[PDB]
């Protein structure tokens, strides 16, 4: 079975082709003692009090290759417990990944991990295909970054790809801040995970933010309780929908950026007029940060308001969209006919790392 | 605090066979002659957790052991209808309350040596009775580390 | 055989590694004539009428080094009858012992007593390990002081260690006072020992203090008799359980402090949320003052009431807990593999007293 | 004359506009008997042995309004001995105070105390203005909390405000702990005040902490004596500078947080690049916990090390910075032209509590 | 221990006039017919402490009294160059050593009644001679409560 590795800014997802879900999901972080020489993933996270933590992927782009190799090492040997030299490997990449990074990735797989074959796939394209479409726009929002990626007949349109450096991690921080305003103080990293858990379980996107604020002021109907690990029960009110509102209004975080609905709209407008209709009618949500209840409806509403009146708007929110990228890769790599599509070690030895551009794009 | 008890090479080898090669499901360690941690029992890859509990206790109610287990459980990611199989290695210190003080001291003071020798273990579990070693108890501890 | 010396505020315990119990247990006191130049231990205690008695250890901390040296001299030459220059020596220390004190202790062993090797161990950690645990919280209550000491994977958590300057000696004084109220007058030091003996033989911890008070008022069923050395028989009633109640309610002694159950709880709460569960489930009692019948049950009850409802509570009261610290040291120091763990005289000569921090912690 | 009330987490400062210093400074605490129905301020503090003490303000945020009303009642009638219905009232608030709290405060002043007019001012902004600046960053450290508050042209930048739940009270506790290690035991609340007094009189911030530690180890030149109320003289050594070091190294208290220098730096970095230069050149210290000798120099040193090399660094430590907030309010409220800036009772009756946001911000 | 002596309403009224209204500087109380504490002397707001000492002693060297005073003094906060005016109410029990035992007993056993009736007094002062009632002595006691 081939190995499938989705390289996220904040989370690494890894498993075996053909599986319905990744086997391993862990933070993409490397920790080193402030005063093993290094810790990776959950282990690093559990020792965060004494470690300096770094992310080798920043907003979808690998910026630290030494640490990235450690992440992959940890993925293959510690999480999946396999020898990579025995398995073809499919890796995902973010949109707009530099060519040099792609080549470096290819080099490390063949030369450092000695994989027999490898393939690189764009995260947004996998997600789109997994939805049965070849033409549409993907709003991909993970832990570290959000992208709008227009795709036409299977080809991403680089000129029209937009990036918002706002995603799940930022929202967790934001929630921490506004909970503090309510009187709950979460100051430690461990506590941050608790807040993340609160966010993922209790937060939602309001259809009408102002109306929801009014409701929250006049009634306790929107309040939910959360039991902390120490047994204390806290009550969360309008923080539930204020937190993800930051996606639509980045100003909540002090960012001078357009929200995800406007960004999506702007991405479509950067495309040729003849394909815009298709993009409006095929907006696919992907990534963990798109799992908020109500987000699809809110997107539908907001895009309808921005688009020409005659335009059909369709937001697609697959249920499995948390792992859509990985699932797409898993299915693809499990096909017997896909075996011919791999970059082989032999091909790499003959053509060098630049072969990745010919075989995968 | 350390006892000075050493870890045999076989322990490291067996550990690699479980972690990397997935040749075995679990291993039980004991302290030989109060001097060195060594391998007592190695179970095949298809062995179940119940067998692990039986093996770690097999030498009597007052006997202490260490146990390494490659634990498999189903994990459902929030928001996804799909359960994925997770595998995590844990290392258990088994020191029953019925054990004599000398044995308890020996095993507790030697545990760190074993931990340092077995790099990559996800969770260390302390157990003094079955309520702490049960599948449910262990799984709960392992899940507590699951990145949401 | 190595020598093991447990340095208690009120009692010194000493013996040979491998033994099941200390060979010598004596008061940690030095006496000097008010008007040999000095007397130590039982001898000092027997001459207390004409001596000024001092404790070189106050609430677990050595405050008088001259007197401490006399205690050790007395330990090695008078009680154990050995030459320390021929034996490695394991010494115990209280939690939060200053670094300077540790170094001074190390200096005195190598330079004054010329021991070939030495090791220092924390009292609470030894007790925890002796129970087969590396993670838990120890309630250590001796003659002079009570500590709650959370330990995680063999490391004490200094920020969460709490001290209650209330222990056995205070209880003896308290018992004297309340016996006086009953009409028994113990005014001399010798008589104080009698009271100590009464306390240790007859006193117990009530599960429900109020109910027990009611029972004592309505029946003589709780009364016990004690024969004094002069043959007189005295009857002790509700003093039996009022005395140790002072541990749970320090106000009985006029102290504005939390009882040992609250202190334990507070210590746990000072720790990270992720380890609290382990601490609740692994509370170990240690020290002579924890030998009261009923204390474990009472602790169980009180902590259960304070802890979150979902929390598992387990109080561990080993039978040998009177000497758990010493026994732990005895076993450790008797292991052949432990020989490599000693600070040698050579190492001390090379690195100075600061070597104790590297080798023992 | 208008009344000026600075609402601190640990201390309430109150007086008349135009005065050079507050008339009343007292603990912001309410006490109730464990077994008058309640005691406030110094009275509560003097009876702390028999009272349960609570702080209605936690880390700058009012969390108990019933108790807060008692504090204000005590301020007006007991400390200042005035009828609030006859005086306009200026109240200060911490940065990031919730809107709801501001409104509640406004409601209580007009409806419960029937003040004819009121104004709310942000503590950090008052302090900055009192220094003759409208642009800068304020490090405000009181009894209960420390804030870094960047201000640009008179407007606080909420996204860049950082909070450290470490301040004077924590330091007092810390000093108690490390004095205990030296052999001095302060266990009672009354004794805690003594320690506070020791801290405020004798403690200082070392320019170089490691060097100072070395000096303290090699000489007694840094030792100072303090006479206790009972006449006993104690000697304080390296505790003098270890205590406030906790501000720069919160790990001394077991906190996983950045020190005040790093926090200040981090706050600046959260601001727009174009104003950072101004913030570096205008760092204003404010609050009682900033009164340590040497703190300004230490801050200067630490920020210089963190900032770009070309950046001008200026730390401003006004002499009156203990009460800078109150003094700023006193001066402002004493101006005849400020009278037009008040929220009047009439305006409140017409617009409700939300008027505070329009008139004061 | 209590004598049963009651406190007149006028005492409470006068107390409020001093504490809240700042109408008066101090008041001297006495026990009328051994039955009730009542107001003897009320001094204007501009009265000084020396006048208070004179008034409380005015009835003779063996006479006991109570005195309430709104005391003003300058307080310099550590670290601040600015002295602020502080005002604290104190209640003094004046029982000179020269007083007869009966009077001493009466006033000492009635003091608590007065304390309970006058809520908000910051400091209670016991004085048997001038060394205990002097401005310096009183100020020292009042400052002892000053939050550093």
- Provide CB contacts within 8 A for C298, sequence distance 6+: C205, C206, C207, C248, C261
Contact between chains at C257 and D187 (C-beta distance less than 8 A): yes
> What 3-state DSSP class applies to E7?
strand
Q: Which of A6, A25, A196 to mutate to test the interface with B (most CBs of B within 10 A)?
A: A25
Which residues in chain C are contacts of D191 at CB distance < 8 A?
Answer: none
Angle in degrees, CA C69, C74, C76, rounded to 5? 95
Contact between chains at A231 and C310 (C-beta distance less than 8 A): yes
CA E97 vs CA D229, D324, E109: distances in Å: 27, 49, 16
The token pair that represents D124 in the structure block:
């950090």
> What 3-state DSSP class applies to D179?
helix
Question: What is the C-alpha end-to-end distance of chain A, expressed in Å?
Answer: 23
Closest of B97, B140, B115 to residue B7, by C-alpha: B115
Instruction: Report yes or no: D42 and D25 within 8 Å, Cβ to Cβ.
Output: no
Q: Which C residues 318-337 touch B at CB under 8 Å?
A: 318, 320, 327-328, 331-332, 335-337
DSSP C212-243: HHHHHHH-STT-EEEE-TTS-EEEE-THHHHH
Pick the CATH number of E1-148 from 3.40.20.10, 3.30.1330.10, 1.10.510.10, 3.30.450.40: 3.40.20.10
The token pair that represents C106 in the structure block:
């190390």
CB atoms within 10 A of CB C10: 19
CA A132 vs CA A127, A136, E109: distances in Å: 9, 10, 95
Q: Is B22 left (phi over 0), alpha (psi -120 to 50) or beta?
A: left
DSSP C75: I
Angle in degrees, CA A202, A25, B146, rounded to 5? 60
Which residues in chain C are contacts of D242 at CB distance < 8 A?
Answer: none
Phi/psi of residue A40, nearest 5 degrees:
-125, 145
CA dihedral A302, A306, A311, A314 (to 10 degrees): -20
Closest of D115, D284, D63 to residue A183, by C-alpha: D63
Instruction: Report yes or no: D118 and D72 within 8 Å, Cβ to Cβ.
Output: no
Cα gap A147→A122, rounded to integer Å:
12
Contact between chains at D165 and A185 (C-beta distance less than 8 A): yes
- Touch criterion met for C and D (3+ Cβ pairs within 8 Å): yes
The nearest alpha carbon in chain C to B36 belongs to C337
Cα gap A76→A83, rounded to integer Å:
7
- Provide CB contacts within 8 A for E92, sequence distance 6+: E56, E66, E67, E68, E69, E124, E125, E126, E127, E133, E138
The nearest alpha carbon in chain D to E76 belongs to D21
Alpha helices per DSSP H over A4-129: 41-46, 65-73, 99-107, 123-129
| Beta-sheet pairing, A155-156 with A162-164 | unpaired
On the 0-12 / 13-18 / 19+ scale of CB atoms within 10 A, A95 is buried
Which of E85, E119, E148 lies at the smallest CB-CB distance from D196?
E148
Cα gap D99→A184, rounded to integer Å:
16
Cα gap E71→A150, rounded to integer Å:
79
Q: Which residue in the block uniquely carries the two structure tokens 């260390």? A: B124
Which helix (H) or strand (E) element contains residue D140?
Answer: strand D136-141
CA E121 vs CA D52, D69, E16, E19: distances in Å: 21, 20, 11, 9
Q: Which residue in the block uniquely carries the two structure tokens 């990579």? A: A84
Cα gap B111→D286, rounded to integer Å:
51
Cα gap A143→E2, rounded to integer Å:
73
The token pair that represents D67 in the structure block:
């108790």
As a whole number of angstroms, the longest Cα–Cα distance in chain C is: 70
On the 0-12 / 13-18 / 19+ scale of CB atoms within 10 A, A160 is buried
Which residues in chain D are contacts of C58 at CB distance < 8 A?
Answer: 183
Q: Which residue in the block uniquely carries the two structure tokens 């609250």? A: C262
Q: What b-and-e string marks burial along A305-314, b requiring 16 or more CB atoms within 10 Å of the CB?
A: ebbeeeeebe
Which residues in chain B are contacts of A11 at CB distance < 8 A?
Answer: 147
Q: Is the dihedral of CA E119, E120, E126, E132 positive or negative?
A: negative
Q: How many residues does chain A have?
A: 361
The token pair that represents A29 in the structure block:
């972080």
Q: Which of D1, D6, D24 to mutate to test the interface with E (most CBs of E within 10 A)?
A: D24
Instruction: Report yes or no: B52 and B69 within 8 Å, Cβ to Cβ.
Output: yes
Cα gap B89→B98, rounded to integer Å:
27
DSSP D11-56: EEEEEETT-SS-SEEEE--EEEE-----EEHHHHHHTTTTEEEE-S
Cα gap A239→A181, rounded to integer Å:
10
Tally of CA atoms within 13 A in the half-sphere of D13 that contains its CB: 27
Closest of D87, D303, D262, D35 to residue D164, by C-alpha: D262
CB atoms within 10 A of CB A232: 11
Which helix (H) or strand (E) element contains residue D165?
Answer: none
CA A89 vs CA A1, A64, C35: distances in Å: 9, 21, 90
Counting as contact any 3 or more CB pairs under 8 A, the partners of E are D
Q: Is the dihedral of CA E1, E6, E11, E12 positive or negative?
A: positive
Contact between chains at D187 and C256 (C-beta distance less than 8 A): yes
Solved using: cryo-EM
- Assign 3-class secondary structure to A168-188: HHHHHHHHHHHHHHHCCCCCC
Distance of residue B88 Cα from the nearest chain C Cα, in angstroms: 19
Angle in degrees, CA B112, B115, B116, rounded to 5? 90
Which of C131, C318, C340 lies at the smallest CB-CB distance from B4?
C340
Contact between chains at C59 and D185 (C-beta distance less than 8 A): yes
The token pair that represents C277 in the structure block:
């569960």
Cα gap C280→C307, rounded to integer Å:
8
The token pair that represents A91 in the structure block:
């890796």
Instruction: Report yes or no: D101 and D62 within 8 Å, Cβ to Cβ.
Output: yes
Cα gap A360→C38, rounded to integer Å:
90
Looking at the DSSP assignment, which residues form a beta bridge with residue D235? D225
Angle in degrees, CA E117, E119, E124, rounded to 5? 90
Cα gap A13→A323, rounded to integer Å:
8
Which of C61, C163, C256 lies at the smallest CB-CB distance from D49?
C256
Distance of residue A83 Cα from the nearest chain B Cα, in angstroms: 7
Which helix (H) or strand (E) element contains residue B12?
Answer: helix B9-19
Closest of D360, D342, D321, D356 to residue D116, by C-alpha: D342
Instruction: Report yes or no: C50 and C34 within 8 Å, Cβ to Cβ.
Output: yes
Cα gap A89→A109, rounded to integer Å:
8
Which of B84, B145, B148 lies at the smallest CB-CB distance from A23?
B84
The token pair that represents C45 in the structure block:
């205690």
> E46 — contact with chain D (CB < 8 Å)?
no
DSSP E147: -
Task: Give the distance, in angstroms, between the CA of residue D310 and the centroid of all CA atoms in the same chain.
Answer: 32
Which residues in chain D are contacts of C165 at CB distance < 8 A?
Answer: 185, 187
Closest of D92, D162, D97, D158 to residue D127, by C-alpha: D92
> What 3-state DSSP class applies to A154?
coil
Cα gap E121→C61, rounded to integer Å:
44
Cα gap A37→E135, rounded to integer Å:
70
Resolution (A): 16.5
Cα gap D220→D37, rounded to integer Å:
50
CA dihedral D296, D301, D305, D311 (to 10 degrees): 70
Q: E130-135, long-range: CB within 8 Å, 24+ apart, which pairs?
A: E130/E53, E133/E53, E133/E56, E133/E92, E133/E94, E134/E53, E135/E49, E135/E50
> What 3-state DSSP class applies to E18?
helix
The nearest alpha carbon in chain D to E74 belongs to D23
Question: What is the C-alpha end-to-end distance of chain E, expressed in Å?
Answer: 35
Cα gap C209→C241, rounded to integer Å:
8
Cα gap C22→C330, rounded to integer Å:
9
Cα gap A154→A148, rounded to integer Å:
15
| Beta-sheet pairing, D315-316 with D283-286 | parallel
Cα gap C201→C194, rounded to integer Å:
11
Cα gap C165→C4, rounded to integer Å:
25
On the 0-12 / 13-18 / 19+ scale of CB atoms within 10 A, C251 is middle
Chains A–B, number of C-beta pairs less than 8 Å apart:
67
Q: What b-and-e string marks burial along A34-67, b requiring 16 or more CB atoms within 10 Å of the CB?
A: eeeebbbbbbbbbebeebeebbbbebbbbeeeeb
Closest of A66, A25, A33, A70 to residue A49, by C-alpha: A33
Domain locations along chain E: 1-148
Cα gap A180→A195, rounded to integer Å:
11
The nearest alpha carbon in chain A to C310 belongs to A231
Chains C–D, number of C-beta pairs less than 8 Å apart:
23
Which of C61, C159, C256 lies at the smallest CB-CB distance from D183?
C61
Angle in degrees, CA C209, C210, C211, rounded to 5? 95
- Assign 3-class secondary structure to A243-255: HHHHHHCHHHHCC
Instruction: Report yes or no: D263 and D164 within 8 Å, Cβ to Cβ.
Output: yes
Counting as contact any 3 or more CB pairs under 8 A, the partners of D are A, C, E
Chain D positions contacting chain C at CB under 8 Å are 49, 180-183, 185, 187-189, 253-254
CA dihedral D72, D78, D79, D81 (to 10 degrees): 100
> B122 — contact with chain A (CB < 8 Å)?
yes
Contact between chains at E78 and D201 (C-beta distance less than 8 A): yes
- Provide CB contacts within 8 A for C208, sequence distance 6+: none
Contact between chains at E79 and D291 (C-beta distance less than 8 A): yes
The token pair that represents D172 in the structure block:
């007092």
Which residues in chain D are contacts of C159 at CB distance < 8 A?
Answer: 253-254
On the 0-12 / 13-18 / 19+ scale of CB atoms within 10 A, C58 is middle
Put the strands of the sheet holding A24-27 in their side by side order: A24-27, A11-16, A3-7, A89-93, A117-122, A343-344
Which of D59, D61, D159 lies at the smallest CB-CB distance from A253?
D159
Which of D63, D160, D256 lies at the smallest CB-CB distance from A183?
D63
Counting as contact any 3 or more CB pairs under 8 A, the partners of C are A, B, D
- Provide CB contacts within 8 A for D355, sequence distance 6+: D106, D343, D347, D348
Cα gap C137→D288, rounded to integer Å:
37
Which of C125, C130, C282 lies at the smallest CB-CB distance from B104?
C130
Contact between chains at D165 and A180 (C-beta distance less than 8 A): no
Which residues in chain B are contacts of C359 at CB distance < 8 A?
Answer: none
Tally of CA atoms within 13 A in the half-sphere of D337 that contains its CB: 0
- Touch criterion met for C and A (3+ Cβ pairs within 8 Å): yes
The nearest alpha carbon in chain D to C270 belongs to D254
| Beta-sheet pairing, A51-54 with A30-33 | antiparallel
Contact between chains at D200 and E83 (C-beta distance less than 8 A): no
DSSP A20: S
- Provide CB contacts within 8 A for A226, sequence distance 6+: A198, A201, A202, A233, A234, A235, A236
Cα gap D184→D181, rounded to integer Å:
7
Cα gap A164→A109, rounded to integer Å:
29
Contact between chains at B144 and C274 (C-beta distance less than 8 A): yes
Which residues in chain B are contacts of A27 at CB distance < 8 A?
Answer: 147
Strand stretches in chain E, DSSP E: 6-7, 24-32, 36-44, 65-76, 83-94, 123-127
Counting as contact any 3 or more CB pairs under 8 A, the partners of A are B, C, D
Instruction: Report yes or no: D9 and D58 within 8 Å, Cβ to Cβ.
Output: yes
The nearest alpha carbon in chain D to E86 belongs to D23
> A18 — contact with chain B (CB < 8 Å)?
no
Q: Calculate helix-pair angle for C273-280, A189-202, nearest 10 degrees.
A: 100
CB atoms within 10 A of CB C315: 22
């Amino acid at each position: 079975a081939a190995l499938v590795v989705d390289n996220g800014s904040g989370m690494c997802k890894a498993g075996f082709a053909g599986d319905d879900a990744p086997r391993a999901v862990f933070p993409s972080i490397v920790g080193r003692p402030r005063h093993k020489d290094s810790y990776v993933g959950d282990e690093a996270q559990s020792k965060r009090g004494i470690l300096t933590l770094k992310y080798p992927i920043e907003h979808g782009i690998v910026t630290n290759w030494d640490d990235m190799e450690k992440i992959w090492h940890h993925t293959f040997y510690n999480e999946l417990r396999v020898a990579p030299e025995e398995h073809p490997v499919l890796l995902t990449e973010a949109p707009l990944n530099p060519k040099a990074n792609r080549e470096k990735m290819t080099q490390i797989m063949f030369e450092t991990f000695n994989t027999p074959a490898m393939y690189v796939a764009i995260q947004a394209v996998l997600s789109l295909y997994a939805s049965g479409r070849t033409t549409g726009i993907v709003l991909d929002s993970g832990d570290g970054v959000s992208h709008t990626v227009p795709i036409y007949e299977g080809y991403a349109l680089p000129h029209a790809i937009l990036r918002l450096d706002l995603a799940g991690r930022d929202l967790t921080d934001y929630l921490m801040k506004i909970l503090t305003e309510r009187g709950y103080s979460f100051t430690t990293t461990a506590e941050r995970e608790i807040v993340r858990d609160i966010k993922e379980k209790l937060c939602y996107v309001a259809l009408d933010f102002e109306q929801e604020m009014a409701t929250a002021a006049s009634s306790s109907s929107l309040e939910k309780s959360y039991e902390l690990p120490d047994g204390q029960v806290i009550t969360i009110g309008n923080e539930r929908f204020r937190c993800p509102e930051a996606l639509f209004q980045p100003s909540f975080l002090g960012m001078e950026a357009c929200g995800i609905h406007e960004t999506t709209y702007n991405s479509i407008m950067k495309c040729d007029v003849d394909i815009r209709k298709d993009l409006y009618a095929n907006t696919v949500l992907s990534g963990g940060t798109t799992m908020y209840p109500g987000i699809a409806d809110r997107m539908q509403k907001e895009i309808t308001a921005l688009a020409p009146s005659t335009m059909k708007i369709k937001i697609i929110a697959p249920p499995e969209r948390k792992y859509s990228v990985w699932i797409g890769g898993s299915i693809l790599a499990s096909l017997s006919t896909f075996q011919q599509m791999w970059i082989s070690k032999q091909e790499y030895d003959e053509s060098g790392p630049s072969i990745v551009h010919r075989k995968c794009f | 605090m350390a006892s000075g008890v050493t870890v045999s090479d076989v322990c490291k080898t067996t550990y690699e066979e479980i972690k990397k090669d997935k040749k075995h499901r679990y291993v039980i360690f004991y302290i030989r002659d109060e001097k060195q941690i060594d391998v007592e029992t190695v179970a095949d890859r298809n062995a179940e957790y119940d067998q692990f509990l039986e093996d770690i206790q097999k030498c009597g109610p007052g006997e202490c052991r260490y146990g390494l287990f490659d634990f498999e459980y189903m994990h459902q990611c929030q928001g996804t209808s799909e359960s994925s199989k997770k595998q995590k290695l844990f290392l258990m210190s088994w020191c029953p309350d019925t054990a004599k003080v000398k044995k308890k001291m020996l095993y507790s003071s030697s545990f760190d040596a074993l931990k340092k020798s077995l790099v990559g273990v996800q969770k260390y579990i302390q157990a003094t009775d079955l309520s702490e070693a049960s599948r449910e108890a262990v799984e709960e501890k392992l899940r507590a580390t699951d990145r949401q």
